[PDB]
Ligand binder design. Structure first.
Ligand SMILES: [Zn+2]
Ligand SMILES: [Zn+2]
Ligand SMILES: [Zn+2]
Ligand SMILES: [Zn+2]
Ligand SMILES: [Zn+2]
Ligand SMILES: [Zn+2]
Lengths: 362, 362
């Protein structure tokens, strides 16, 4: 007996095209998404070149329209030079992303005043997402309050962070957040196995106490999202390993395992991978779209999943219960039992759908 | 013709007793204060042992009562273990100090949740001061808002910081701040002369643009305070130089020079070294207390000032106009032309004066 789920949404993926296509591209990353039961993804802007101006966005849109196998929206990225310049293209993006901790030169903001400038100039009705760790979460919350608008905090990883967000919500502040599977299912205890290279991720893996705090505060978590951040094994195992884990193909099986163990309900899962992503990012429904999963199938995660070009996984050896059997996307079979059956280019930019525009006052 | 000023107050000094008395002690540091026209000081808690519990405060109070030549109040310091434990002694302190960036093990807070715990437990009517740089200013402002109370930000040093505080004040938030003389009168341009050891200070010296921003935003600055942070030349010039500059003896002459040049008025100076310190920290008046200064005397700052045991100064070679001629403290001549004339122990704990208790609801 299969369970039918709606089309799941991952609001935080790095698909590496343009500029890092040995790590992943739109075609491989969206194949990974479909195999993980994900029918819509929001792609981050830290590509090469990064998506920080209209021409880069235009290029990315065409690459995605030509390569994506599932539907998508593309983020713009905040830079030290582009505040006040994105107004005409802002509505065509998933939202604006601010990289407030480590990142490359082009996306680095050197002052909180630059954060404020973005919050002041980006259209008030459109999403803003921050990569913000530890005290940076409090700092960007302050900027959001000074500018009287909302903010979404990516990949909350620590007890410190989830409790701060909990306190902000208790004061009625408009903040939402997401948690990634590696911060629910891996911890410091796994660093021995992973090693210092493969184990490199930002936010870093937390303590057992951090992991337990995220589970205990599930009510505070609005979304799950993978932070799919593919890098090859050569890169992860080399002299200056980049941070990040691939995660599209493993996210749903890990979470289904947790549902089977009664750690959260099926509804808790669907709020966090479907309804809340829709409502926070104003993402449209997908007609005739659904995912069929088998909740009884027990398997062990292998050394690499079939589709991501990362060709490794930090969850290797974990036992899971739950697997994606079939995905239907807009009336076409997109995935069955290990085979992707829609071509590159089948996917569409949801921000171009009439129902995918974010409502605003005239 | 001498100008009579009221007794000036420095709300931010490190007097190093107990535990660092080769760098300074109460007797030498308060001699330096008097020579700088300062009749009341608030001493920071990062001594050895640090002032983080009632017994350490009791010791510090007696050392100060025995050694101080001017009047004083003593800060308590926040630790990872003392939130909720300081209620009985809190009112006897200048306030509570939080070290939110670099500091030693005992005063290190590892989580914003610990900041929140202090803001929640420290009596709401008593001062809280934070060492907070760059985004940490925004973060502690957020904590202050979540807990619905005020905060005072020490030594603002950057354009980024003063503009953030300016924005917070424009939203009506209860925040005050201070600036130290080295951030008004020194910059990156001086690092060549000072070298990497002597030049070490936290917050670090700013760019010319940082300095210009602080002057342009003088209206946002509530207090001046020295952050007198004495270390010996051997320490500053050695392999792991501690951050900090001595500043009690040079602060007023530097600022009087600026008054003479019309960079700020005498009133602007007295608001920031007398009236605002009084009102932010609820410090009592000092009867029959005043400072006589000569505004016409031109001199060059030497390689060390007479009183601080630091025995060096980063302002060496700067030309100033303005000098302290006489100080009278509670009806006794305390300083004349280079000679301190009150003994160690003349100074008193102002929090023990009836007028020095902070008013509170019953
Ligand atoms: Zn991130
Ligand atoms: Zn990311
Ligand atoms: Zn539903
Ligand atoms: Zn400080
Ligand atoms: Zn200090
Ligand atoms: Zn006055």
């Amino acid at each position: 007996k299969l369970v039918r789920l709606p089309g799941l949404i991952d609001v935080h993926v790095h698909l590496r095209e343009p500029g890092g296509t040995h790590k992943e591209d739109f075609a491989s990353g969206t194949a990974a998404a479909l195999a993980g039961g994900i029918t819509m993804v929001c792609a981050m802007p830290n590509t090469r070149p990064p998506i920080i101006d209209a021409p880069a966005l235009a290029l990315a849109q065409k690459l995605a329209e030509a390569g994506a196998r599932c539907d998508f929206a593309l983020f713009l990225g905040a830079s030290s030079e582009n505040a006040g310049t994105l107004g005409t293209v802002a509505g065509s993006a998933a939202g604006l992303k601010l990289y407030l901790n480590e990142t490359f030169s082009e996306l680095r903001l050197d002052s909180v005043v630059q954060w404020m400038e973005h919050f002041e100039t980006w259209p008030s009705h459109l999403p803003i997402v921050a990569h913000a760790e530890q005290q940076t979460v409090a700092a960007v919350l302050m900027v959001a309050q000074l500018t009287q608008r909302s903010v979404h905090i990516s990949h909350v990883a620590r007890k410190e962070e989830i409790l701060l967000i909990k306190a902000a919500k208790a004061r009625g502040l408009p903040v939402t957040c997401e948690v990634a599977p590696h911060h629910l299912f891996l911890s410091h205890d796994d660093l021995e196995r992973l090693g210092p290279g493969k184990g490199e991720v930002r936010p870093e893996l937390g303590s057992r106490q951090d992991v337990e705090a995220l589970w205990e505060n599930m009510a505070v978590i609005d979304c799950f999202a993978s932070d799919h951040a593919p890098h090859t094994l050569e890169e992860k195992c080399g002299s200056r390993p980049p941070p990040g884990f691939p995660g599209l193909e493993t996210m749903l099986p890990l979470l289904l395992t947790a549902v089977s163990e009664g750690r959260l309900s099926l509804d808790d899962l669907l709020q966090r991978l479907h309804h809340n992503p829709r409502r926070i990012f104003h993402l449209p429904p997908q007609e005739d779209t659904y995912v069929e999963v088998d909740l009884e199938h027990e398997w062990t995660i292998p050394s690499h999943m079939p589709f991501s070009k990362a060709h490794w996984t930090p969850f290797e050896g974990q036992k899971v219960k739950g697997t994606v059997r079939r995905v239907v996307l807009r009336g076409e079979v997109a995935y069955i039992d290990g085979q992707v059956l829609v071509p590159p280019g089948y996917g569409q930019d949801v921000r171009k759908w009439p129902q995918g525009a974010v409502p605003q006052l005239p």
